[PDB]
């Protein structure tokens, strides 16, 4: 149907909108702490501590197979990213302190995102 084209389009671009706000978001991890899964091999233990596991390159995988269908969706996902640190590592650590920056740095680039997926529809 046509809908379902037009319905596809408006995905598309939300995958647009998510793409750009991922890179954003990305560039406010230099140190590259959050860009890949935490390794089972180096942290054996880690899914005794951490039940949903996240990291940049699984988002960015979801992302292309257009598997985020709103805004929400894809700020849970980055949430966990966050909150998963913040438990595993203690606070005087590079690791929390990274996921609070990230937090802090974030957030303004999810405001306007909000505003823009609002807006644009």
Request: hydrophobic share 65%; net charge neutral.
């Given at each position: 149907s046509m809908e379902q084209v037009a319905m596809e389009l408006r995905l598309t671009e939300l995958t647009r909108l998510l793409r750009s706000v991922l890179d954003q978001l990305q560039d406010k991890d230099p140190a590259r702490?959050?860009?890949?899964?935490?390794s089972l091999k180096e942290v054996p233990d880690y899914l005794d501590h951490i039940k949903h596991p996240m990291d940049f390159a699984t988002m960015r995988k979801r992302l292309e197979a257009q598997g985020y269908k709103n805004l929400h969706e894809f700020e849970e996902d980055f949430d966990l990213i966050i909150d998963n640190c913040m438990k595993y590592n203690a606070r005087d650590t590079v690791f929390y302190r990274a996921a609070v920056r990230l937090r802090d740095q974030g957030g303004v680039v999810l405001r306007q995102a909000r505003r823009e997926v609002d807006s644009i529809g």
């Open positions: 702490i959050f860009a890949q899964p935490v």
